[PDB]
């Protein structure tokens, strides 16, 4: 609605401090601002955004914002060059997608090793001595095993990588979920559960209740969890993650960002809120007092927060890890690794079979979500030499082991296809996108009577 601001923030982040900023914003301008924290908002936001009854400002890590920008759900920002100097250029690079600068960077988040001084005096420097430490404590460590963000630093410790980054450009064809280091890293996590050092059904909520009650010696969490552990009065410490095979753990670096809905008529009010009220020491100190943000992007406030040992330990783990890509293909990568880690913890599939499926699903399967009623442009890149002289096709796979029904084929209703044979780019145009059009399509190259898969495409349709 015109004249109002709706903000969505994560249930694990501090919305009480942000609500205090809303009272200061409402006091000076007279605009009521409502902060909400719906569950699974990272999946719920795109469904409701384009409709109109969506939030004006969304808070989430920067890896999800690239799929939003490609779908046209977020407006380009023009923070006056003077204002950009207030934030660190490193944080601005995280929120840059095709030069758009879609979102405002707020805070930098990174996992840390949190251990209780009651249960453990000196934390282990290596992963390998945790099984022996758990035998003496019998627990040694409890952390979320349902989200791959928490278990990735062990997988990435031995050289595992998501998408190769060569000269500022990510190579979507070089995915490393089944490399030599990931197989050794994931096996260690499974062996911890097989040896009854961890449980396969442990989630985030269990770890918060267990560690804050002095039941486990260590946990793995971000800065947002410090406020609830301080309330438990347990003397906890924040330190560097243990090394694996002599190599440091590489946690994925997250940048808390605020995006403005493209359909919201309150962009100016939101921009005036984000620039003049959110990104100040006054606004962030109120939010930081609710739930810690970590390493903030504002230089003036970061100079004070960095003196805190909890924030300094977060930077130590952040410097050992790499920043998350903001490309749209990251969403399919996270779900594939999430499903693979869960199967290995339960023992239903081996580590080799779990990572083999996750690598395949993460390779050339970019999820596309377009707004209903508008056009959706998919670009299937392919080798122009290997497939030279071959016609292309665009078909819908009906089953997991079923046939692919040829919607259109190159040299149909609301689907048009064009082939750039010189540049190696196949483009399919969907006009007036509607529901039921979602259905895991495939880009194919025809030779004789056989067809090779160029890139499986998972289309999703927003409610609009």
């Amino acid at each position, epitope marked *: 609605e015109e004249g109002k601001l709706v903000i969505w923030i994560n249930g694990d982040k501090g919305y009480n401090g942000l609500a205090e900023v809303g009272k200061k914003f409402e006091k000076d301008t007279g605009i009521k601002v409502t902060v909400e924290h719906p569950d699974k908002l990272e999946e719920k936001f795109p469904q409701v955004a384009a409709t109109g009854d969506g939030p004006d400002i969304i808070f989430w890590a920067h890896d999800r914002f690239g799929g939003y920008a490609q779908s046209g759900l977020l407006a380009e920002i023009t923070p006056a060059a003077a204002f950009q100097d207030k934030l660190y250029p490193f944080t601005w690079d995280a929120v840059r997608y095709n030069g758009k600068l879609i979102a405002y960077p707020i805070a930098v988040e990174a996992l840390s090793l949190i251990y209780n001084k009651d249960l453990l005096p000196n934390p282990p420097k290596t992963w390998e001595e945790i099984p022996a430490l758990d035998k003496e404590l019998k627990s040694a460590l409890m952390f979320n095993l349902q989200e791959p963000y928490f278990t990735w630093p062990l997988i990435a410790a031995d050289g595992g990588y998501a998408f190769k980054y060569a000269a500022g450009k990510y190579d979507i064809k070089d995915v490393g979920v089944d490399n030599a280091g990931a197989k050794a890293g994931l096996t260690f996590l499974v062996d911890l559960i097989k040896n009854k050092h961890m449980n396969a059904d442990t989630d985030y909520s269990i770890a918060e209740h267990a560690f804050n009650h002095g039941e486990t010696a260590m946990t793995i969490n971000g800065p947002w969890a410090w406020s609830n552990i301080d309330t438990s009065a347990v003397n906890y410490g924040v330190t560097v993650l243990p090394t694996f095979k002599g190599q440091p753990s590489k946690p994925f670096v997250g940048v808390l960002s605020a995006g403005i809905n493209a359909a919201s008529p309150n962009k100016e009010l939101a921009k005036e809120f984000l620039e003049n009220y959110l990104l100040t020491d006054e606004g962030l100190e109120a939010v930081n007092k609710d739930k810690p943000l970590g390493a903030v992007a504002l230089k003036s406030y970061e100079e004070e927060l960095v003196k805190d040992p909890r924030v300094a330990a977060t930077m130590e783990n952040a410097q050992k890890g790499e920043i998350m890509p903001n490309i749209p293909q990251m969403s399919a990568f996270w779900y594939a690794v999430r499903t693979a880690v869960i*199967n290995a913890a339960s023992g239903r599939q081996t580590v080799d079979a779990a990572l083999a499926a996750a690598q395949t699903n993460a390779h050339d399967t970019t999820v596309f979500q377009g707004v209903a009623g508008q056009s959706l442009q998919v670009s299937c890149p392919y080798d122009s030499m290997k497939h030279w002289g071959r016609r292309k096709a665009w078909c819908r796979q009906l*089953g*997991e082991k079923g046939p692919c029904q040829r919607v259109v084929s190159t040299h149909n209703g609301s689907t048009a296809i064009t082939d750039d044979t010189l540049g190696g780019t196949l483009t399919i145009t969907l006009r007036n996108l509607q*529901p039921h*059009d*979602a*259905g895991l399509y495939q880009c194919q190259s025809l030779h004789g009577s056989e067809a090779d898969t160029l890139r499986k495409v*998972l289309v999703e349709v927003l409610a609009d």
Partner: antibody
Amino acid sequence: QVQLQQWGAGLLKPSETLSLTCAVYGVSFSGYHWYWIRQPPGKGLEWIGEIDNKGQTNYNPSLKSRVTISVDTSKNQFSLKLSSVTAADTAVYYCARGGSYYGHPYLAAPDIWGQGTMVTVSS
Amino acid sequence: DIQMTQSPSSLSASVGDRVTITCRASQSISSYLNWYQQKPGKAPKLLIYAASSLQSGVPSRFSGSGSGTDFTLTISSLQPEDFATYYCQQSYSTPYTFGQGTKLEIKR
């Protein structure tokens, strides 16, 4: 070419936990919606919960405090669990699949149904 | 949760009659209402999806109409096997609630 067959405890006592399993033959759980729907004797249908093609679970808010739906892909079975069963839970329970294959959830209306299992809860 | 209201609760008609059954939603569900036919002792069978698209194999005498809040299922020429209880289902909401149902009987 694809059918669902159900089995489980048909007789329960109050305060116990209901456990029903529904076996799927011919297709994996990926790509479709999978529903649990119950029908009390002489009453209409009641939606218990669903799972999405991505494994996301959604429950009826009136039953969210007592429902747990899980899937075992190794046996291609998916189960319905009722924590604090009460006499009001006497019903025929149906498992059903949505027929989109990675389509939109609007058209994922249950088109393939199991035979259902009569569950009677009484002291 | 969206409330679904069917009318009439029970209806009797002869073979060949043209029958209409109404389903009203408590709020706008766009055009995503589904119709089912349930005979005694059997599992429900999907007839209409997305308000007007008939599932493959259902007789052409079944037809659906409506949008937003008011929807209608129509049997153009009633047949002896069509007599059963019919249910409407919305697919717009997060919980997928059903209507009270409409018992179809034979006049005598």
